Amino acid sequence: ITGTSTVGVGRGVLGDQKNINTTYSTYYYLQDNTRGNGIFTYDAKYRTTLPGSLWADADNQFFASYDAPAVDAHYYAGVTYDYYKNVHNRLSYDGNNAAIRSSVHYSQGYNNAFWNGSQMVYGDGDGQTFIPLSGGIDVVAHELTHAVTDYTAGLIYQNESGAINEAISDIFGTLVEFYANKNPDWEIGEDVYTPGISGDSLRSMSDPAKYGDPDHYSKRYTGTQDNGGVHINSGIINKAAYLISQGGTHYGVSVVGIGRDKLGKIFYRALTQYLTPTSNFSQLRAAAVQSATDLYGSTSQEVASVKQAFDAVGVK
C-alpha cells in the first residue's frame, strides 16, 4: 500500500518485545519499506486462501495473542533479508529485491510452514506438536531459503536433489539463527516444537540420528514417503555441513572445522554457481570442493576439510 514508513512495537510468539517496520495509511500495515521492495505480512484468518489480507492494525501496537505470529514472521523475514544482503551481497530471494510476502494463521491446527512458489506460509500449530511456526527464526529463514534455492540452483524437490534442497534450507536457517545470535544452535525448530517437551527439535544437524535421520550415506532412505525422504536424507548433508564448520571425528574420519562463515561462503557459492536442478549428493560434494577451491585455493585447509566431511558421511 502507499503510505509513510513507521515503527511499531509488539510481542512475538515467545513473549519477547520487538520493534517492527510498518506503513501508515489510515491503518498501520505490516509492510516494511526499509528492505528492498518491501516485506509484507498477511493474515490468512485460519483459512487456506492465500495470501489473505495485508495485516492491518489500528494503533501500531502488536501485543495481542493473535498478533504474535505476524510480528515474528515480519521481523524474522527482515533478519533473513539482512543476512543475505550483508553476508552474501544478495538482494532478496531473487537477487533483485523482490518483495517478500508471508501469511500467518494459515488453516487450523496446522503443524507446518512452507514456500508455495510465491510466498511463505505459516501454520499456528495444534498447540501440542507446535506453537506458531514463525516463532522460530531458523524456520523462517528455512522457508525464505527455499525461495533462494528455487531462483538459483532450482533443486527438484524429490530424492537426492530434494534432500540437498532441504539441507540448504536447514544450513542457512541455522546460519541466520547464528547471525541474529539469540540462543543459536545446530538444531532445527527447537523454539516452536513440542511446547510440553524441553530439549527436543524437528531435526539435529550435529547429530541427525537423534531424531531418526541418517548421518551416513549407507543409511539413506530410498522409499517413496516424504518425496523420497527429502527431510530424512537431508541429515547426511546437514551432518557434512556441521562437520565442515565445527569439526569432529565421525565413523572414524576426522574433520578439521573451518567455522560458520566459511561454511556459509562455500555453500552459498555452490548453490548459486554450481548446483543444478538435478544435482545429486556426489555432485554437491564436487560443487563444494570447487567452491572452496575458488575461494581459498586448491591446497587450502578449507578444501581439505570439505573433502574430509563428505568422506565422513560416505559421499564420494
Ligand X SMILES: CC(C)C[C@H](NC(=O)[C@H](CO)NP(=O)(O)CNC(=O)OCc1ccccc1)C(=O)O
> Which residues make up the interface to Ca ion (CB under 5 A)?
57, 59, 61, 138, 177, 183, 185, 187, 193-194, 197, 200
Question: What cell does 239 get?
Answer: 551432518
Determine if residue 193 is labeled as part of a ligand binding site. Answer: yes
Say if residue 194 is exposed, middle or buried (CB neighbours under 10 Å; 0-12, 13-18, 19+).
middle
Binding mask 124-143 for ligand X (x = CB under 6 A): ---------------x--xx
Supply the minimum distance, in Å, between the C-beta of residue 143 and ligand X. Answer: 5
In angstroms, rounded to a whole number, what is the distance separating the alpha carbons of residues 32 and 46? 23
Provide the grid cell at 72: 515474528
Are 240 and 233 spatial neighbours (Cβ–Cβ below 8 Å)? Answer: no
**By the rule CB under 6 A, 190 interacts with ligand X:** no
Annotated binding-site residue? 194:
yes
Instruction: Draw the binding track, 197-236, toward ligand X (x: CB under 6 A; -: no contact).
Output: -----x----------------------------x-----
CA distance 159 to 166: 11
Interface pick for Zn ion out of 169, 174, 245, 290 (rule CB under 5 A)? 169
Q: How many residues bind ligand X (CB under 6 A)?
A: 14
Q: Is 302 a catalytic residue?
A: no
- Which member of 143, 160, 250, 302 is catalytic? 143
Q: Does residue 299 contact residue 256 with C-beta atoms inside 8 Å?
A: no
Q: Which is nearer to Ca ion, 70 or 255 (CB)?
A: 70
The reply to whether 57 sits in an annotated binding site is yes
CB crowding 67-91: b at 16 or more within 10 Å, else e: bbbbbbbbbbbbbbbebbeebbebb
Q: Which residues pair with 21 in a beta bridge?
A: 7
DSSP state of 271: I
Q: Which is nearer to ligand X, 25 or 48 (CB)?
A: 48
Residue 160 annotated among the catalytic residues of the structure: no
Was 207 annotated as part of a binding site?
A: no
CA distance linking residue 287 with residue 237, whole number of Å: 13
- Binding site for Zn(2+), by residue number, is 142, 146, 166
Which chain residues interact with ligand X by CB under 6 A? 111-117, 139, 142-143, 146, 157, 202, 231
